[PDB]
Amino acid sequence: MPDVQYPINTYGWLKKAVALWADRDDDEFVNQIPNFINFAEKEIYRNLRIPPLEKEVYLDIKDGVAYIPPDYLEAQWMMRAKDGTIFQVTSPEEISYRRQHGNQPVNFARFGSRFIFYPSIEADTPYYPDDGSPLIPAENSVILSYYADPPEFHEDTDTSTILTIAPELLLYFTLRHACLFVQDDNGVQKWSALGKAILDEMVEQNKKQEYSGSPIAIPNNMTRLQSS
């Protein structure tokens, strides 16, 4: 019934293309298209890991109590902004052992909703109500890179990189839940297969993107640097 333009750029046109690609369109159906899209995006971001949904940010360690941000889903490289240094993640028992038994390497763990560090780190960041003030990040400022949970659509004008990069993915993953809402199985299976194929293509692209500029050959690393 409804019309739509060639590019599905925004939520407003996606919620109409959904009803178009499925003639099952009416009052009792269009009102829940938002819920189907919500379920589809949740099913997507639950396991999708790609750059465009990443986010880098400084942390405040406070030697221990340091807390995990709300948007934490998976941690990428973690380091500082001074001469470079990469942390490695270990288990709580290793850190508890390090505490008593005893600074080039630095470890960390995940205690519930915290990030513990064996050394008494003193990373500094501006407080909450600070107005602007980039602060010219001081030293001992760790920078964390992780995968952040993207926002949920709340306005027809609201767009997202997924719409501009792969709208068919959302359209199929939401037609799945649509054909589930109504009684239909063939469409469910076909849309699920197509969405899974698109997601596989995207993750394979991400894979072929990483470490894709030259071959590798470990040069028999046996710690040439031992003197220190």
Partner: peptide, 29 residues
């Protein structure tokens, strides 16, 4: 590149850490 100093505006509709519809009020208060 940025800091987490902005104010709470929404809930984690996807994500096992953070806030919920029954806890966002606490964050805002």
């Amino acid at each position: 590149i940025v800091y987490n100093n902005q104010a709470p505006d929404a809930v984690n509709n996807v994500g096992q850490f953070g806030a919920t519809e029954g806890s966002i009020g606490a964050y805002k208060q």
